[PDB]
């Protein structure tokens, strides 16, 4: 029964998921004055030309755009990563107000939302095995600010009415995630965790420095989703973000000067 509400929010998660107080929890604040350039980081390689989206699902805490991950169709390599990581899904976190919504922060700045493109290390064969490994996942995180619309997001926005409530899914084929990327692939990276229960410490985070812009209208449509199932009391799906967790014995590295 975890969530983002008054009585079940992030500050309660530790009771059912004790790793919430672990050594490598995410998100974190990215301090641009202490993150150090690492010249031995490589450019990231984002290879999404063959991506096959299938479906969009409201899971009661966000919505996931799901991909066919049964072949190397959409993969992330390079950067800090060794080997090949396959795209499985993306989802967002967002706020009730434009001054909040992101999970990572930059010098304590909160963005309006954050996109997570989740990839698993093919050496482990499937997602469920991957999340049990320290290097099982690579999550590409991208900040969203409100300004000009992002054309490449509109097809996502378009479909939200069809998945208003928890447990609803809709076919969502032929969506191109390249339309969600900023111009630059400059990034910060650090070891951490999933940001929802089970909070497993299996993630190499790759957080892009450049945000994407989305429009007010686009964000407003995200805020019409519901946490609840159909025929239950409406509770708007907003503020579905975990706050920054202690960095502990970690360093954030930058791919850029």
Swiss-Prot record:
Binding positions for substrate per the UniProt entry: 195-196
Record note on cofactor: Zinc. Can also use cobalt(II) with lower efficiency, but not copper(II), nickel(II) and manganese(II).
Domain of life: Eukaryota
Variant or mutagenesis effect after changing residue 103 to D: Normal CO(2) hydrase activity
Catalytic activity: hydrogencarbonate + H(+) = CO2 + H2O; urea = cyanamide + H2O
Annotated effect of mutating residue 196 to S: Enhanced p-nitrophenyl acetate esterase activity, but normal CO(2) hydrase activity
Record InterPro entries: CA_dom, CA_dom_sf, Carbonic_anhydrase_a-class, Carbonic_anhydrase_a-class_CS
Keywords for this protein: Acetylation, Cell membrane, Cytoplasm, Disease variant, Lyase, Membrane, Metal-binding, Osteopetrosis, Phosphoprotein, Zinc
Residues the UniProt record annotates as site (Fine-tunes the proton-transfer properties of H-64): 4, 59, 64
Active site: 61 (proton donor/acceptor)
Known cofactor(s): Zn(2+); Co(2+)
Listed result of changing residue 114 to Q: Strongly reduced activity and sulfonamide affinity
Phenotype upon changing residue 116 to E: Strongly reduced activity
Known outcome of mutating residue 64 to H: Enhanced proton transfer
PANTHER family: CARBONIC ANHYDRASE, CARBONIC ANHYDRASE 2
Quaternary organization: Interacts with SLC4A4. Interaction with SLC4A7 regulates SLC4A7 transporter activity. Interacts with SLC26A6 isoform 4 (via C-terminus cytoplasmic domain).
Additional comment: Target of drugs used in treatments against glaucoma disorder and breast cancer.
Protein's recorded name: Carbonic anhydrase 2
Gene symbol of the encoding locus: CA2
């Amino acid at each position: 029964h975890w969530g983002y509400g008054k009585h079940n929010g992030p500050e309660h998660w530790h009771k059912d998921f004790p790793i919430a107080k672990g050594e490598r929890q995410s998100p974190v604040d990215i301090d641009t004055h202490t993150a150090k350039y690492d010249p031995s980081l490589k450019p990231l390689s984002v290879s999404y030309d063959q991506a096959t989206s299938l479906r969009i699902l409201n899971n009661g805490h966000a919505f996931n755009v799901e991909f066919d991950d049964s072949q190397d169709k959409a993969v992330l390599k390079g950067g800090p990563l060794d080997g090949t990581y396959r795209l499985i899904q993306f989802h967002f976190h967002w706020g009730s107000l434009d001054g909040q919504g992101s999970e990572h922060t930059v010098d304590k700045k909160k963005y309006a939302a954050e996109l997570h493109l989740v990839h698993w290390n093919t050496k482990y064969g499937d997602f469920g095995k991957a999340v049990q490994q320290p290097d099982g996942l690579a999550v590409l995180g991208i900040f969203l600010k409100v300004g000009s619309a992002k054309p490449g997001l509109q097809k996502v926005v378009d479909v939200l009415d069809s998945i208003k409530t928890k447990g609803k899914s809709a076919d969502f084929t032929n969506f191109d995630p390249r339309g969600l990327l900023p111009e630059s692939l400059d990034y910060w990276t650090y070891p951490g965790s999933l940001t929802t229960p089970p909070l497993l410490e299996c993630v190499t985070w790759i957080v892009l420095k450049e945000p994407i812009s989305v429009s007010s209208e686009q964000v407003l449509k995200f805020r019409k989703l519901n946490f609840n199932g159909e025929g239950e009391p409406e509770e708007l799906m907003v503020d579905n973000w975990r706050p920054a967790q202690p960095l502990k014995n970690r360093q954030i590295k930058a791919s850029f000067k």
